Amino acid sequence: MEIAYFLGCIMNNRYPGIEKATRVLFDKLGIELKDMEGASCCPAPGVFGSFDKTTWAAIAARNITIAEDMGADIMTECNGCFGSLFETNHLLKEDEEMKAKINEILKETGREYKGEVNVRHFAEVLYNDVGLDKLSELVEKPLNLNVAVHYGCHFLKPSDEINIDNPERPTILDEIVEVTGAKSVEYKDKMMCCGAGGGVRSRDLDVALDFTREKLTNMKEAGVDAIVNVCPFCHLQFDVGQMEIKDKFGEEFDIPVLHLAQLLGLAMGLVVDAHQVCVDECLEKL
Amino acid sequence: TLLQREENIIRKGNIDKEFSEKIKAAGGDSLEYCFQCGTCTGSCPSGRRTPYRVRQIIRKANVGLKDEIISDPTLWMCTTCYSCQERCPRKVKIVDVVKLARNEAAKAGFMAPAHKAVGSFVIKTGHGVPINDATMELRKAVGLGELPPTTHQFPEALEEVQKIIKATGFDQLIGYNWETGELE
Amino acid sequence: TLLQREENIIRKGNIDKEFSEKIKAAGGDSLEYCFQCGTCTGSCPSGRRTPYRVRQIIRKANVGLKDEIISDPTLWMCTTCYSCQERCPRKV
Amino acid sequence: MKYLLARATDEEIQRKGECGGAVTAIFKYMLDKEVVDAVLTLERGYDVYDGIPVLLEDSSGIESTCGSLHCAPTMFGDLISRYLSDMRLAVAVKPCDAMAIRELEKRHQIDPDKVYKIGLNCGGTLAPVSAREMIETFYEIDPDDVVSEEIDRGKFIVELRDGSHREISIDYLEEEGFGRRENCQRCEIMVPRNADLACGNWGADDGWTFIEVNTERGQEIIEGARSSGYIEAREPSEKMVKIREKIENAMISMARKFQDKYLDEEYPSLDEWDEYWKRCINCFACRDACPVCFCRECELEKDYLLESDEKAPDPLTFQGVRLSHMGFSCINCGQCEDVCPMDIPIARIYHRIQKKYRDRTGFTAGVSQELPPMYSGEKD
Amino acid sequence: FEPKIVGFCCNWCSYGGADTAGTARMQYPPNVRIIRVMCSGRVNASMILKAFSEGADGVFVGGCHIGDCHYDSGNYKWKRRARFIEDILPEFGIDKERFRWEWISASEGEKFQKTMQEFYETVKYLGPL
Amino acid sequence: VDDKALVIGGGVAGIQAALDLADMGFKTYMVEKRPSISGRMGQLDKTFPTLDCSMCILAPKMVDVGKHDNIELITYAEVKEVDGYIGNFKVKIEKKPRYIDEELCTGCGSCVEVCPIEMPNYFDEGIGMTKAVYIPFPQAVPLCATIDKDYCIECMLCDEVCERGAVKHDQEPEEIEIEVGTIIVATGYDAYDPTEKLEYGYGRHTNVITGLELERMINASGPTDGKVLKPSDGEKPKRVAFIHCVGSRDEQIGKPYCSRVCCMYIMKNAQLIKDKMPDTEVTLYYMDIRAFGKGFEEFYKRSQEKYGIKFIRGRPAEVIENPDLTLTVRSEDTLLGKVTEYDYDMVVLGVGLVPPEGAETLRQTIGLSKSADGFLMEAHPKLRPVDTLTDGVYLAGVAQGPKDIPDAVAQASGAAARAAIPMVKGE
Amino acid sequence: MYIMKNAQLIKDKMPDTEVTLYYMDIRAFGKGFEEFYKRSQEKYGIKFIRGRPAEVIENPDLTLTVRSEDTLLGKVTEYDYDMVVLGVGLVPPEGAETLRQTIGLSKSADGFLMEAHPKLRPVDTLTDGVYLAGVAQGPKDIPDAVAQASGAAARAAIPMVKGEVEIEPIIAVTDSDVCGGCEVCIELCPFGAISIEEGHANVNVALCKGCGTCVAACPSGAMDQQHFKTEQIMAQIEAALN
Amino acid sequence: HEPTFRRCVEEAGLNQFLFEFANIREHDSWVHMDNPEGATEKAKDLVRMAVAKARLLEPLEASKVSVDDKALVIGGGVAGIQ
Ligand SMILES: Cc1cc2nc3c(=O)[nH]c(=O)nc-3n(C[C@H](O)[C@H](O)[C@H](O)COP(=O)(O)OP(=O)(O)OC[C@H]3O[C@@H](n4cnc5c(N)ncnc54)[C@H](O)[C@@H]3O)c2cc1C
Ligand SMILES: Cc1cc2nc3c(=O)[nH]c(=O)nc-3n(C[C@H](O)[C@H](O)[C@H](O)COP(=O)(O)OP(=O)(O)OC[C@H]3O[C@@H](n4cnc5c(N)ncnc54)[C@H](O)[C@@H]3O)c2cc1C
Ligand code: SF4
Ligand code: SF4
Ligand code: SF4
Ligand code: SF4
Ligand code: SF4
Ligand code: SF4
Ligand code: SF4
Ligand code: SF4
Ligand code: SF4
Ligand code: SF4
Ligand code: SF4
Ligand code: SF4
Ligand code: SF4
Ligand code: FES
Distance from CA of A119 to the nearest CA of D (A): 16
Distance CA A190, CA A203 (A): 24
Q: Which of D380, D345, D346, D350 has its CA nearest to residue D365?
A: D350
F172-F178-F182-F186 Cα dihedral, nearest 10 degrees:
-10
**Cis status, amide bond into G143, omega within 30 of 0:** no
Distance from CA of F23 to the nearest CA of C (A): 48
- Give every CB contact of residue F205 below 8 A, 6+ residues apart in sequence: F319, F321, F325, F327, F347
Q: In whole angstroms, how large is the CA radius of gyration of chain H?
A: 23
Q: How far is the CA of D346 from the centre of ligand 8 (A)?
A: 8
The beta strand positions in chain D, using DSSP E, are 3-8, 38-44, 51-56, 89-93, 115-120, 146-151, 155-160, 165-169, 197-200, 209-213, 231-234
Distance CA G158, CA H30 (A): 42
Coil/strand/helix, residue F293: coil
Q: Which of A212, A211, A200, A270 has its CA nearest to residue A240?
A: A212
**Cis status, amide bond into F116, omega within 30 of 0:** no
**Position E89, amino acid:** L
Q: DSSP code of C28?
A: I
Distance CA C44, CA C59 (A): 16
**Are the beta carbons of F361 and F187 closer than 8 angstroms?**
no
Q: How far is the CA of F55 from the centre of ligand 2 (A)?
A: 13
H/E element holding F164?
A: none
The pocket around ligand 14, CB under 6 angstroms, is made up of G 174, 179-185, 201, 218, 220, 222-223
Spacing of C-alpha D207 from chain mean position: 23
Distance CA D203, CA D244 (A): 5
Q: How far is the CA of C90 from the centre of ligand 5 (A)?
A: 7
G75 phi and psi angles, rounded to 5 deg: -155, 150
H58 vs E: CB within 8 A: no
- Chain A residues with CB under 8 Å of a chain C CB are 204, 206-207, 210
CA distances from A244 to C54, F149, G111 (A): 43, 93, 55
Distance CA F216, CA F122 (A): 11
Alpha helices for F40-156 (secondary structure H): 55-67, 110-114
**Are the beta carbons of F61 and F15 closer than 8 angstroms?**
yes
Q: Which of D341, D127, D254, D276 has its CA nearest to residue D262?
A: D254
**Are the beta carbons of F72 and F79 closer than 8 angstroms?**
no
- CA quadruple D11, D13, D17, D19: dihedral sign: negative
Task: List F208's β-bridge partners, or say none.
Answer: F347
The pocket around ligand 15, CB under 6 angstroms, is made up of G 171-172, 188-189, 191, 193-194, 203, 208-215, 225
CA distances from A81 to A45, A53, A121, A194, A236 (A): 8, 15, 9, 16, 14
Q: For chain D, what's the residue count?
A: 380
Q: Which of G123, G177, G118 has its CA nearest to residue G150?
A: G123
G67 phi and psi angles, rounded to 5 deg: -85, 115
CA distances from B56 to A11, B35, B38, G74, G75 (A): 37, 11, 9, 9, 11
Spacing of C-alpha F404 from chain mean position: 11
H/E element holding F182?
A: strand F182-185
Chains G and F contact (Cβ–Cβ under 8 Å for 3 or more pairs):
yes
- CA quadruple G6, G7, G12, G14: dihedral sign: positive
Q: Which of A5, A3, A105, A88 has its CA nearest to residue A44?
A: A88
Distance CA C7, CA C14 (A): 10
Residue D182: CA atoms inside 13 Å, Cβ hemisphere, count? 22
Q: Which of B34, B108, B95 has its CA nearest to residue B66?
A: B108
Starting from the edge strand earliest in sequence, which strands make up the sheet with F174-180, in order?
A: F77-83, F89-95, F174-180
Coil/strand/helix, residue F71: strand
Distance from CA of B16 to the nearest CA of A (A): 22
Q: Which residues of F touch G150 (CB under 8 A)?
A: 386, 413-415, 417-418
Cβ distance F338 to B8 less than 8 Å, yes or no, reads yes
Distance CA F332, CA G74 (A): 14
Q: Which residues of F touch B10 (CB under 8 A)?
A: 333, 336, 338-342
Alpha helices for B24-169 (secondary structure H): 39-43, 54-63, 66-70, 83-87, 94-108, 113-125, 133-142, 155-168
Q: How many helices (H) and strands (E) does chain F have?
A: 9, 24
In ligand 15, the atom with minimum distance to the C-alpha of G193 is: 5
The pocket around ligand 12, CB under 6 angstroms, is made up of F 114-115, 117, 131-133, 147, 152-158
Distance CA G49, CA G36 (A): 17
Distance CA H48, CA H25 (A): 16
- Give every CB contact of residue C62 below 8 A, 6+ residues apart in sequence: C20, C31, C32, C34, G47
Distance CA F347, CA F230 (A): 10
Alpha helices for G29-138 (secondary structure H): 33-42, 96-103
G111 phi and psi angles, rounded to 5 deg: 90, -5
Q: Which residues of F touch E105 (CB under 8 A)?
A: 53, 56
**Are the beta carbons of D272 and D349 closer than 8 angstroms?**
no
Alpha helices for chain G (secondary structure H): 2-13, 33-42, 96-103, 142-162, 213-217, 230-241
Cβ distance A167 to B86 less than 8 Å, yes or no, reads yes
**Are the beta carbons of D318 and D300 closer than 8 angstroms?**
yes
Q: How far is the CA of D108 from the centre of ligand 14 (A)?
A: 11
G120 vs F: CB within 8 A: yes
User: What is chain F's percent helix, strand, coil content, to nearest 5?
Assistant: 25, 25, 50
Distance CA D94, CA G43 (A): 79
Break sites following residues in chain E (C–N > 2.5 A):
none
Resolution reading in Å: 2.4
Instruction: Give which of G1, G2, G119 to mutate to test F binding, by max F Cβ within 10 Å.
Output: G119
Distance CA A162, CA B82 (A): 13
Distance CA F284, CA G4 (A): 27
- CA quadruple G71, G74, G76, G81: dihedral sign: negative
Is the shortest distance between the CB of F14 and ligand 13 below 6 Å?
A: no
Q: Which of D7, F59, F345 has its CA nearest to residue E13?
A: F59
E72 phi and psi angles, rounded to 5 deg: 80, -20
Coil/strand/helix, residue D276: helix
User: Within 10 Å of residue F278's Cβ, how many Cβ atoms?
Assistant: 9
Q: DSSP code of D21?
A: S
D235: phi > 0 → left, psi -120 to 50 → alpha, else beta; which?
beta
Distance CA G36, CA A198 (A): 47
Alpha helices for F196-281 (secondary structure H): 211-218, 262-276
Distance CA B44, CA B61 (A): 18
Distance CA B65, CA A151 (A): 37
User: Within 10 Å of residue D241's Cβ, how many Cβ atoms?
Assistant: 16
Query: What single string gives the DSSP state of each residue in A86-153?
Result: HHHHHHHHS-SHHHHHHHHHHHTTT--------EEEHHHHIIIII-HHHHHHT-SS----EEEEE--H
Query: What single string gives the DSSP state of each residue in G136-190?
Result: GSS---HHHHHHHHHHHHHHHHHHHHH-EEEE-S--EEE-TTT-----TTGGG-T
Distance CA A74, CA A36 (A): 9
Nearest CA in chain G to B48: G76
Coil/strand/helix, residue E39: coil
**Position D9, amino acid:** T
Coil/strand/helix, residue E103: strand
Chains E and D contact (Cβ–Cβ under 8 Å for 3 or more pairs):
yes
Distance CA F76, CA B144 (A): 99
Q: Which of A84, A92, A14 has its CA nearest to residue A47?
A: A84
Q: What angle do CA G179, G184, G186 make, to 5 degrees?
A: 90
H77 is in an annotated binding site: yes
Q: Which residues of A touch D245 (CB under 8 A)?
A: 116
Q: What is the 3-state secondary structure (H, E, C) of A76-89?
A: ECCHHHHHHHHHHH
Q: How far is the CA of F331 from the centre of ligand 5 (A)?
A: 12
Distance CA H65, CA C71 (A): 83
**Are the beta carbons of G8 and G17 closer than 8 angstroms?**
no
Spacing of C-alpha B120 from chain mean position: 15
In ligand 11, the atom with minimum distance to the C-alpha of F110 is: 3
**Position E119, amino acid:** F
- CA quadruple D289, D293, D295, D301: dihedral sign: negative
Cβ distance A40 to B161 less than 8 Å, yes or no, reads yes
Give the chains touching C; criterion: ≥3 Cβ pairs < 8 Å: A, B, F, G
User: Within 10 Å of residue G231's Cβ, how many Cβ atoms?
Assistant: 15
User: Within 10 Å of residue F86's Cβ, how many Cβ atoms?
Assistant: 17
Q: Which of F249, F290, F358 has its CA nearest to residue F48?
A: F290
Is the shortest distance between the CB of D184 and ligand 8 below 6 Å?
A: no
**Are the beta carbons of D194 and D368 closer than 8 angstroms?**
no
User: Within 10 Å of residue B109's Cβ, how many Cβ atoms?
Assistant: 10
Q: Which residues of G touch H64 (CB under 8 A)?
A: 164-167
Coil/strand/helix, residue D217: helix
**Are the beta carbons of B163 and B97 closer than 8 angstroms?**
no
Distance CA F225, CA F217 (A): 7
CA distances from C55 to B60, F256, G30 (A): 21, 20, 28
- CA quadruple E43, E45, E47, E51: dihedral sign: positive
F380 phi and psi angles, rounded to 5 deg: -140, 130
- Give every CB contact of residue F371 below 8 A, 6+ residues apart in sequence: F377, F401, G31, G32
Is the shortest distance between the CB of F132 and ligand 11 below 6 Å?
A: no
H/E element holding F247?
A: none
Question: How many angstroms separate the most distant Cα atoms in chain F?
Answer: 70
Spacing of C-alpha D236 from chain mean position: 25
Distance CA D195, CA D117 (A): 5
Cβ distance B46 to A207 less than 8 Å, yes or no, reads yes
Q: Which of F252, F310, F260, F268 has its CA nearest to residue F285?
A: F310
- Give every CB contact of residue F234 below 8 A, 6+ residues apart in sequence: none
Distance CA D143, CA D137 (A): 10
Is the shortest distance between the CB of C58 and ligand 6 below 6 Å?
A: no
Q: What is the 3-state secondary structure (H, E, C) of B134-165?
A: HHHHHHHHHCCCCCCCECCCCHHHHHHHHHHH
Q: Which of D170, D139, D140 has its CA nearest to residue D154?
A: D170
Strands G164-167 and H63-66: antiparallel
